[PDB]
Amino acid sequence: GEELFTGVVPILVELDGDVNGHKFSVSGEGEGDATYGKLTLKFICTTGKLPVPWPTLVTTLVQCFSRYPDHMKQHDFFKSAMPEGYVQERTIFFKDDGNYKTRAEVKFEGDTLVNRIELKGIDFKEDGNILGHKLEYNYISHNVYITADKQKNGIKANFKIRHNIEDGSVQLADHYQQNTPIGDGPVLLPDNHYLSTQSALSKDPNEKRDHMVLLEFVTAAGIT
Ligand SMILES: [Cl-]
């Protein structure tokens, strides 16, 4: 699996979403360079206006592009599952608001690394921070704490994302994650460690569709 990531890899993302019955679709394209932990992607809402804030979809919208230190390469579950891939499931609990439940398959289709996602959101407040679009277009959170899930031949993670609200407050998004291989092949089950991620959000000044440009750098750490 490692060998599939030594160069620059094209990425395709497809998301189908339904949040309190507000249906939407997102497509994304770009590339990943795992040697540097570097992702460059542009996402488009193909159905018109996105009915939730873009920052709330960042974590849902390819941890196989993380840079694992040489000394930690035996802990890289995500690449080890390739090319057949993995299922990534989350529940994201927005404090004092609704929750997303996501199921994605991350796998190669030829030379392209594909992330295909279904997102279901329920129990949101129609005038809350999410459906009311009260979140700032920025990102402040960084670590994903990974542990092995031996019983499921995979991993789990939990981490908190804080999203800045327009009034200076923060909207917590508590993430619970589980990943399992798609194939029957072997995978690497890691010792406890984390991924340190930074995501920078911007706009394409020539793009009239609702969209998000993302530049991300991700490095594994915590074993030394
Ligand atoms: Cl937004």
Swiss-Prot record:
Signal peptide: none annotated. Changing S169G: In GFPA; leads to enhanced fluorescence at 37 degrees Celsius. In Venus; leads to yellow fluorescence, improved maturation and reduced environmental sensitivity. Pfam families: GFP (PF01353). Changing A200V: In EBFP1.2; shifts the excitation and emission spectra to shorter wavelengths and increases quantum yields compared to BFP. Changing V62L: In EYFP; leads to yellow fluorescence, folds faster and more efficiently at 37 degrees Celsius and has superior solubility and brightness. Changing E216G: Suppresses the 399 nm excitation peak, leaving only the longer wavelength peak at 475 nm. It comes from the Eukaryota. GO terms for biological process: bioluminescence; generation of precursor metabolites and energy. Changing I165V: In EBFP1.2; shifts the excitation and emission spectra to shorter wavelengths and increases quantum yields compared to BFP. The keyword Phosphoprotein does not apply. Green fluorescent protein has been engineered to produce a vast number of variously colored mutants, fusion proteins, and biosensors. Further generation of mutants led to more stable proteins (at 37 degrees Celsius for example) with brighter fluorescence and longer fluorescence lifetimes. Changing Y139C: In mut1.9; shifts fluorescence lifetime from 3.03 to 2.74 ns. The keyword Ligase does not apply. Changing K73R: In Topaz; shifts the major emission and exitation peak up to 20 nm. Belongs to the GFP family. This is Green fluorescent protein. It comes from Aequorea victoria.
